[PDB]
Every structure is written in structure tokens, then in C-alpha cells.
Design a protein around this motif. Structure first.
Motif, PDB file in Angstrom:
ATOM      1  N   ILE A  80      50.968  41.133  43.217  1.00 58.08           N
ATOM      2  CA  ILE A  80      49.544  41.284  42.940  1.00 58.08           C
ATOM      3  C   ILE A  80      48.931  42.336  43.858  1.00 58.08           C
ATOM      4  O   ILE A  80      48.056  43.107  43.444  1.00 58.08           O
ATOM      5  N   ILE A  81      49.408  42.415  45.104  1.00 56.03           N
ATOM      6  CA  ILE A  81      48.937  43.452  46.016  1.00 56.03           C
ATOM      7  C   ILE A  81      49.359  44.833  45.520  1.00 56.03           C
ATOM      8  O   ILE A  81      48.607  45.806  45.646  1.00 56.03           O
ATOM      9  N   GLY A  82      50.545  44.933  44.916  1.00 54.66           N
ATOM     10  CA  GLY A  82      50.969  46.202  44.347  1.00 54.66           C
ATOM     11  C   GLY A  82      50.144  46.613  43.145  1.00 54.66           C
ATOM     12  O   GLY A  82      49.786  47.787  42.997  1.00 54.66           O
ATOM     13  N   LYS A  83      49.828  45.654  42.270  1.00 55.62           N
ATOM     14  CA  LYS A  83      48.955  45.949  41.138  1.00 55.62           C
ATOM     15  C   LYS A  83      47.570  46.371  41.611  1.00 55.62           C
ATOM     16  O   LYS A  83      46.960  47.286  41.043  1.00 55.62           O
ATOM     17  N   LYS A 136      45.692  49.917  40.998  1.00 54.59           N
ATOM     18  CA  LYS A 136      44.326  49.991  40.484  1.00 54.59           C
ATOM     19  C   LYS A 136      43.432  50.837  41.387  1.00 54.59           C
ATOM     20  O   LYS A 136      42.629  51.647  40.899  1.00 54.59           O
ATOM     21  N   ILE A 137      43.566  50.664  42.707  1.00 53.38           N
ATOM     22  CA  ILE A 137      42.762  51.431  43.656  1.00 53.38           C
ATOM     23  C   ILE A 137      43.061  52.917  43.525  1.00 53.38           C
ATOM     24  O   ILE A 137      42.147  53.749  43.473  1.00 53.38           O
ATOM     25  N   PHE A 138      44.347  53.272  43.477  1.00 53.60           N
ATOM     26  CA  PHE A 138      44.694  54.686  43.400  1.00 53.60           C
ATOM     27  C   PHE A 138      44.282  55.285  42.063  1.00 53.60           C
ATOM     28  O   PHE A 138      43.876  56.451  42.004  1.00 53.60           O
ATOM     29  N   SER A 139      44.364  54.502  40.983  1.00 56.13           N
ATOM     30  CA  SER A 139      43.891  54.983  39.689  1.00 56.13           C
ATOM     31  C   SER A 139      42.396  55.269  39.723  1.00 56.13           C
ATOM     32  O   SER A 139      41.945  56.301  39.214  1.00 56.13           O
ATOM     33  N   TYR A 198      41.575  46.106  51.128  1.00 59.91           N
ATOM     34  CA  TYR A 198      40.295  46.470  50.518  1.00 59.91           C
ATOM     35  C   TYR A 198      39.291  46.965  51.550  1.00 59.91           C
ATOM     36  O   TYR A 198      38.610  47.974  51.328  1.00 59.91           O
ATOM     37  N   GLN A 199      39.177  46.267  52.685  1.00 63.73           N
ATOM     38  CA  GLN A 199      38.182  46.654  53.678  1.00 63.73           C
ATOM     39  C   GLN A 199      38.493  48.019  54.277  1.00 63.73           C
ATOM     40  O   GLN A 199      37.594  48.855  54.418  1.00 63.73           O
ATOM     41  N   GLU A 200      39.762  48.278  54.609  1.00 60.43           N
ATOM     42  CA  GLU A 200      40.108  49.580  55.167  1.00 60.43           C
ATOM     43  C   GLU A 200      39.935  50.694  54.140  1.00 60.43           C
ATOM     44  O   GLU A 200      39.425  51.771  54.475  1.00 60.43           O
ATOM     45  N   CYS A 217      34.275  43.666  42.078  1.00 60.08           N
ATOM     46  CA  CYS A 217      34.798  43.066  40.856  1.00 60.08           C
ATOM     47  C   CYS A 217      36.313  42.893  40.929  1.00 60.08           C
ATOM     48  O   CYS A 217      36.840  41.830  40.589  1.00 60.08           O
ATOM     49  N   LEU A 218      37.026  43.920  41.403  1.00 61.92           N
ATOM     50  CA  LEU A 218      38.483  43.861  41.483  1.00 61.92           C
ATOM     51  C   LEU A 218      38.978  42.806  42.465  1.00 61.92           C
ATOM     52  O   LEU A 218      40.139  42.393  42.376  1.00 61.92           O
ATOM     53  N   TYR A 219      38.136  42.371  43.400  1.00 61.20           N
ATOM     54  CA  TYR A 219      38.512  41.286  44.298  1.00 61.20           C
ATOM     55  C   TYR A 219      38.100  39.925  43.744  1.00 61.20           C
ATOM     56  O   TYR A 219      38.920  38.998  43.677  1.00 61.20           O
ATOM     57  N   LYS A 220      36.839  39.798  43.318  1.00 61.49           N
ATOM     58  CA  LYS A 220      36.310  38.518  42.872  1.00 61.49           C
ATOM     59  C   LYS A 220      36.807  38.112  41.491  1.00 61.49           C
ATOM     60  O   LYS A 220      36.571  36.968  41.086  1.00 61.49           O
ATOM     61  N   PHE A 221      37.473  39.002  40.755  1.00 63.04           N
ATOM     62  CA  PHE A 221      38.031  38.617  39.467  1.00 63.04           C
ATOM     63  C   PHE A 221      39.464  38.131  39.580  1.00 63.04           C
ATOM     64  O   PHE A 221      39.973  37.513  38.638  1.00 63.04           O
ATOM     65  N   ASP A 222      40.123  38.399  40.707  1.00 65.12           N
ATOM     66  CA  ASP A 222      41.486  37.951  40.926  1.00 65.12           C
ATOM     67  C   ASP A 222      41.618  36.938  42.051  1.00 65.12           C
ATOM     68  O   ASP A 222      42.721  36.421  42.261  1.00 65.12           O
TER      69      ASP A 222
END
Length: 314
Positions: free
Chosen positions: A70-73, A77-80, A120-122, A145-150
Motif C-alpha cells: 500500500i505504501i508503494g501504491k 500515486k504521489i509521483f503521478s 506524506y508529511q516529508e 484525500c489520498l490519506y483519509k480514503f485509505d
């Protein structure tokens, strides 16, 4: 992550490499001993025991990888998204090396939940400064959203989507919100205080941010670039920064060929003895910048410089 997050995985990888080297050395020694015995006509057991013990290491690594997918996904997502930001405007180029550096600096400074929170914070705290205010709000809410949805339920996701929609004047309806947070949010949207609603979101999720002094403080490279709208100027901001940091700043406006020669001489002097260099309005001599400064960029200590350009420029 396997190299610098868990000591067990690194220790097992080192042990496996050492066991392979020991097996190769034992095979070479056995061949040499057989050759010596033919010419004159416990190590193997230990190597076999080590190989039998190390034969079961891959399932543990596979389980660890499956537990950390999940961290890889999320990283993908972040890089996209950060690559999409380089397409919305041309000054927001984000590459693989910078994101690898920030993910390494995550570790340089609920284990899965905490490591994902740190990522996420860094990433937000390092990539926010390179954006204007509206895209900063946009990217902050996309990470929210990407944090609170997962980490949370599906009704929360639907409520966030429908209240973003009523914020966007696209879809209107009463949400199924599920505390005093709801009271503040309703008192904001019913009072039509949109900036207060975005401020409340940003203060609710993100608790840290970098100012100009913070972003210039936690920096390593000797090349900097600074941009702004033409109605806002960061020259005196850099002056106050250098006064607070006790650094010698000399402003160098661009322009004529004499100004270019003066800039070249002063950046040579600052590469010699250190200091701070500001090139005001690098939009002036665009070709001169693209030749001279690009050739200079492509290792003195206590040397920093800055470039001031414009968002609505070339």
C-alpha cells in the motif's frame, strides 16, 4: 526500505551474501584439495547447514513486501500527481531523483501507518514551497484525500467528495457526515466562508509548514531558483534573510553586456570566497542565462546563490 528501515532484513541479506561467498570459497577449497590429493596419489558440512538454514528467507521477504504494498501504491500515486503538476504549468518539473531523495530523507531524519504518515508529511513539507498558493491548497487537499480514503471508511470518502462538490458548485446535497469539526464545517459552508473552509481543512490535517527561512535552512545544493508573480518581489525578502543569517548578499540586476560581465566576475568571486548571490530578473538576458549559468551549473563551501524569475515569463 529493505536497506534502511528494518535491521532484520538487512542482516539477513548480508548473511545470505556471506553464505553464498562462503559456499563459493568452500567449493573452490574442495576443488583445490581434490586436485592436491590427485597430484599426491567440516567446512562442507557447515556450508551445507548454512545453506539449509538460509533456504527459507524468501518467504519472509515476500510476506514483508506484501505487507508493504500500500505504501508503494501511495508512492506511485504521489509521483503521478507531482508529474501531472509539471504538465499543468511548465515550471513545476518533478523527477524521480528528487522524490527518491525525499523518500530517503524520510528515514534520514502501527509501523506501516507511521512510515506512511512520515512519507506524506516529508513529501508535502518539501514539495509545497515550489508551488503557488492555489496549487498548494489543491495538492494539500489531494494528499488529505489520498490519506483519509485509505485509512478510513467509505462513507467518509463519499462525504468528502460531496462536500468538495458543493464547494466546487458542481454537485449539491446533504452529506452523510460522521463532533465539533462538523459544527465548524457547517458554520463555514452555510456562511459561504470558502477561504475559512479551506483554511480549516489545511489546519485540520497538516500541522507543519515551511516558511522561506525554513526552506532555505534545510537545503544542501549550492544552486537555487526563485520565482514569483511580477507584482511581488523577493529581493528585500532575501535581504532580510541574509541579515538574519549574517550572510553577505549583493543584488545583481541583469541587463546590458557590462552587467553580464559584472555578474560573471561577482559569481566568480563568490565561488572563490563564498557569499550569497542574487540575480534579479533573470528573464532579461535569457540566452545569456541559458548559456553561462547552465554551463556553470553543469564545489566551494559556504557558497549559496539565488535566481529570481517570473511565473508569467518565458
Amino acid at each position: 526500505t529493505l536497506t534502511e528501515e528494518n535491521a532484520e532484513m538487512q542482516r539477513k541479506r548480508e548473511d545470505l551474501i556471506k553464505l553464498n561467498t562462503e559456499y563459493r570459497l568452500k567449493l573452490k577449497n574442495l576443488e583445490k584439495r581434490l586436485l592436491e590429493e590427485l597430484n599426491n596419489s567440516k567446512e562442507a558440512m557447515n556450508i551445507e547447514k548454512k545453506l539449509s538454514e538460509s533456504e527459507e528467507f524468501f518467504p519472509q521477504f515476500d510476506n514483508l513486501v506484501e505487507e508493504y504494498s500500500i505504501i508503494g501504491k501511495h508512492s506511485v500515486k504521489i509521483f503521478s500527481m507531482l508529474e501531472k503538476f509539471g504538465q499543468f504549468h511548465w515550471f513545476y518539473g518533478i523527477s524521480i531523483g528528487q522524490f527518491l531523495s525525499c523518500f530517503k530523507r524520510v528515514f534520514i531524519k502501527t509501523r506501516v501507518d507511521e512510515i506512511l504518515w512520515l512519507l506524506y508529511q516529508e513529501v508535502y513539507c518539501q514539495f509545497s514551497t515550489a508551488l503557488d498558493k492555489k496549487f498548494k491548497m489543491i495538492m494539500a487537499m489531494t494528499m488529505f484525500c489520498l490519506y483519509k480514503f485509505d485509512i478510513e471508511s467509505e462513507q467518509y470518502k463519499e462525504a468528502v467528495l460531496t462536500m468538495i462538490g458543493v464547494l466546487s458548485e458542481s454537485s449539491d446535497g446533504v452529506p452523510k457526515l460522521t463532533n465539533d469539526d462538523l459544527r465548524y464545517l457547517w458554520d463555514y459552508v452555510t456562511t459561504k466562508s470558502y477561504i475559512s473552509a479551506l483554511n480549516w481543512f489545511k489546519n485540520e490535517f497538516f500541522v507543519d509548514e515551511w516558511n522561506i527561512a525554513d526552506v532555505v535552512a534545510n537545503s544542501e545544493n549550492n544552486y537555487f531558483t526563485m520565482a514569483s508573480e511580477r507584482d511581488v518581489d523577493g529581493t528585500f525578502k532575501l535581504i532580510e534573510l541574509a541579515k538574519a543569517s549574517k550572510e553577505s548578499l549583493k543584488i545583481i540586476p541583469l541587463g546590458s553586456i557590462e552587467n553580464l560581465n559584472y555578474a560573471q566576475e561577482e559569481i566568480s568571486k563568490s565561488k572563490i570566497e563564498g557569499g550569497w548571490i542574487l540575480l534579479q530578473n533573470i528573464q532579461m538576458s535569457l540566452s545569456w542565462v541559458k548559456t553561462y549559468l547552465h554551463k556553470h551549473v553543469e564545489e566551494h563551501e559556504k557558497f549559496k546563490m539565488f535566481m529570481t524569475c517570473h511565473l508569467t515569463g518565458d
